[model samples]
Target: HWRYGGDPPWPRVSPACAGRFQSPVDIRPQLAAFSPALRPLELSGFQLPPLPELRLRNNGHSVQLTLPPGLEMKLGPGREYRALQLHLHWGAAGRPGSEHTVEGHRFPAEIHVVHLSTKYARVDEALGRPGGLAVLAAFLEEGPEENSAYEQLLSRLEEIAEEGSETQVPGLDISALLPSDFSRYFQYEGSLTTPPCAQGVIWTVFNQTVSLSAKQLHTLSDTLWGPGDSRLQLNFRATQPLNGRVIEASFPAGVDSSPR
Candidate 1:
């Protein structure tokens, strides 16, 4: 919680927290520029028939799902990034939880799939440099039916409800967690939403949202962080200023450019 700030000891530890290219900016449709250079998103190893073992943990902030090797994304020319992990950010029931809002509308939750550039051998080494990471973001909205794709992970939430608790997740098709339409997205250069808020991440936020049931949302919202008495709600960083940086969209037509 302390590290989410931009002043004092926070900047001393994470200098980029106070930088110009910070992330989690509001993606206002009117402000985004139509860019033909933004290519269609491509992912590898996400739809494997038998996905590898995943490690699920309560990291005091959110429930993180760690991916094994062999997953990567082709993020334009000469920019291939290896998948590292995926996590969620959410708020209590009836509250806006997503980090990035769409025309001032916030969803109940958001998912972030993190990847590091192939140029750096290690993730930490890449984080210290520009264009070091790529984070694919998807919003989560409540729906009538339960998402079977999330049941495998949500079914085991109680096992790791407390901080530092972890469990082994069985085969999971990572692609099932994302929105079906990958052709449209908002692309921008920004920092990590979490601290050591390193700036150099290329963010691709899908315009569509994934669905989850009310029960599933409750399970995620009520998860404890520290102990049985402590609850972890509002696990998201506030949207940062755009600071003259442009946000580009792959499909600009049919997108309402009305002011928010």
Candidate 2:
């Protein structure tokens, strides 16, 4: 029962919230080392169709969409995780709400596609293990034209404006929601930003930002209502301290980038 703002030092629902390892870090590209082991992420089951109607909901916190099974992501070898759901954290119209900032800059919006290791039977089991979860996150910024892929969902926001509200939408090519250039990304170990705020998560943040029309952003930030009938804007947690953690990059990072 915590909101994003109001108190700089908010109540800790769990010690995990104050745990040493946390997420939504401000990535300093120059400090990230290029890791030879970090390969191009392999994805499957992304090209979706309309047969399976996806449930989109307000969820009181953020707009969440249920992803169908078979959507899996692999970093390399045995590190395969199954996609479960996707949601967005956004700012009010004319503000930035991205969780992971870059070099002190903030993107207006962000996408978080949550996944769990295939080795686990259910999310509850995975949540208790280290590196049991993988979240693919990407920033969203302004662009010239409307992204048709996003419109399919954005067009339906009005249907779920109230808290706990939901609706069904036609399936779409889910892959189209991410950036085309995903080769360059930042990898790190962190945790969930919400309650229980566990401390074992693998985060992959793409360097490139996805584009959406201004109108679409307006709908995203202004449409949803939360507890107390408040507009569910800026549903993002602030960045946490890295505490000497190293962020690995897939491509040549900064001067720190090397084949090693």
Candidate 3:
């Protein structure tokens, strides 16, 4: 339904779409258990130079960016995941459409940086396999200051204006797209929050969110197009149920993840 751009486009027909371990759940600060072993995720190769341009495409569902090699995330000793592609989910003119919510509250948008285990040949192969892929999810909110890191990608929005259209974006500090505080986040075992809804994905939803100016956010919402040239808006899936799964927080409860 989300791929169509039209509201309530025929309901999908996938068994896993309604699976137990679905992602993007509403995480109440109180429910997420504090895990002392959950370390701050270490990232590498995010500050790539701006020589080789990355492919930015309007996949109709959302604007996706193809990542270059060398981008990797380290969980622990000998365990690593390579960054593949990163895409964004946003709302329409007024509605905020972040996939994952905090205390049942939605952010302005969300960014999902998709990755696959080193042993997995392709992202397609890893789907539904246990511990196959890991997604670094972060909320995108509004603030007074502008983020130039996001501007590098957002500046190329008009180039990929139509569905299936492509454009080139100079590489920048990819990690800057995420929050400065990486130590605080919620960890859970879940499935992709989209169609096919494959199971067994490691989801890391950060407590701190990235900020974009109000004007910049408007450009993000009003720019792209879906199929039939429909203004691609509300390209996010609603928050799924937690079922019997547990959410682990890197930081302890009662620590407000708020502005300074």
Candidate 4:
């Protein structure tokens, strides 16, 4: 759970670990079966083609991305892979809550924009074509004390703990972690909560929610990095099997739903 600039081994998963796709799971029946043709399954619309090796890392609260831009992802008809590197599925104090859940109610953390299409592209070809990978799940609530672009990498969480401790947390925009009701969202077809949990992704998930308080969720569970070094409390994966699958939503049917 570390990577401020670059180098060591920030590839997470080790606190009472499990596998086979883990996450907060609850996505309210997967958002009651989403819609909008899933917006081409989005990986970053405007029509793909602009990835000169993107790398976004920050394990203070959760974030690990590093790819050669050999990107590839498919949605819509679904089929494509290649563009792997992304993580986040928190809870346990980070407040509000959501590793993925809906009917049960929970929304506080869930950001997993991982990709790797080309249908396992020989075990990794960036997830193939159509729309290959487009996961944008973002949710975190507890507004009031503004200012948070991830608190500049969660205040450096102990100078990037272990695992290939990399750095480079400069500006790091990421479209400002997007969330202004993003038009609408709640698409599906998932997998990869970690470990060979491979499955064609195209999960959007944004109904607007990004405001961390509660002391920034206890400064990210009192500064992450579990197993051996201790500290623990870094939340990531623990839910799976929406199996019956449908979950879609992005709102329409007469806007102005009030409650801002």
Q: What shift in Å separates residue 41 of candidate 4 from its native position after superposition? A: 10
Native RMSD of candidate 3 (Å): 2.6
lDDT of 3 at 219: 86
TM-score per candidate, in order? 0.91, 0.94, 0.93, 0.32
lDDT of 4 by residue, 138-159 (tens): 7766677753666755666556
Give the per-residue lDDT digits (tens) of candidate 1, residues 58-110: 88778899888878888788989988899988888778689998887789999
Point out the worst 10-residue segment of candidate 2 by lDDT. Answer: 4-13
Whole-model lDDT per candidate? 0.84, 0.87, 0.86, 0.53
- Candidate 3 lDDT score at position 245: 90
> Which prediction has more favorable lDDT, 1 or 2?
2
- For candidate 4, the 10 contiguous residues with the lowest summed lDDT are 2-11
lDDT of 1: 0.84
Candidates 1 and 2 compared by TM-score, better number: 2
- Write the residue-wise lDDT of candidate 3 on 1-260 in tens digits: 44644554323567777787888789887988999988889998999888798889998888898999999897656568999999999997878989989899999999999999987989889989887899999999999988888988888898888888998878888998999898989989998877778989999999889999998899899999888747788888777888889999898867448778
Could you give the candidate ranking by lDDT, starting with the highest? 2, 3, 1, 4
Q: What is the lDDT of residue 198 in candidate 2?
A: 78
Given candidate 2, what's the lDDT at residue 111?
Answer: 98
Candidate that scores best on TM-score: 2
